[PDB]
């Protein structure tokens, strides 16, 4: 059973979702964001030194 849910991009806050599959007893899932990675696509122009 596929369960789709939307949670805010906030690390450290636990969010609870109710999974209700028709004909089956409800299920509660606790989700918490531990860390969020944003890697930018880079293009080296040049390098500077002494």
């Amino acid at each position: 059973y596929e369960h789709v849910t939307v949670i805010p991009n906030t690390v450290g806050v636990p969010y609870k979702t109710l999974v209700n599959r028709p004909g089956y007893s409800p299920m509660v899932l606790e989700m918490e964001l531990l860390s969020v990675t944003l890697e930018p696509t880079l293009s080296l122009d040049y390098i500077t030194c002494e």
Binding site: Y1, R21, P22, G23
Partner: protein, 98 residues
């Protein structure tokens, strides 16, 4: 059979028995009683069950209607069942039904 009440804790209108019904009763003696739906839209999985006195029975039922008001004939006495069945997850099934 006397004092009869019908409670539907779970119902999902599908090709198979997606409904559960609990029927309370007051029996005169220990014996076998036939179970049959008096409504042509609802079908019961159980053909016959055992009764004693002041007890209950769990039955599996199949229906297509969302709002299902059906009469169940246990032994020789009838009971009215109120059910608000919900749609299933699948639109196409792999087995035929009534």
């Amino acid at each position: 059979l006397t004092d009869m009440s019908c409670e539907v804790p779970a119902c999902t209108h599908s090709s198979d028995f997606g409904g559960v019904a609990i029927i309370k009763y007051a029996a005169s003696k220990k014996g076998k009683c036939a179970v049959h739906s008096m409504t042509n839209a609802v079908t019961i999985r159980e053909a016959e069950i055992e009764v004693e006195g002041n007890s209950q029975l769990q039955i599996s039922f199949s229906t297509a209607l969302a709002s299902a008001e059906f009469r169940v004939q246990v032994c020789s006495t009838q009971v009215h069942c109120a059910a608000e069945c919900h749609p299933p997850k699948d639109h196409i099934v792999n087995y035929p039904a009534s």
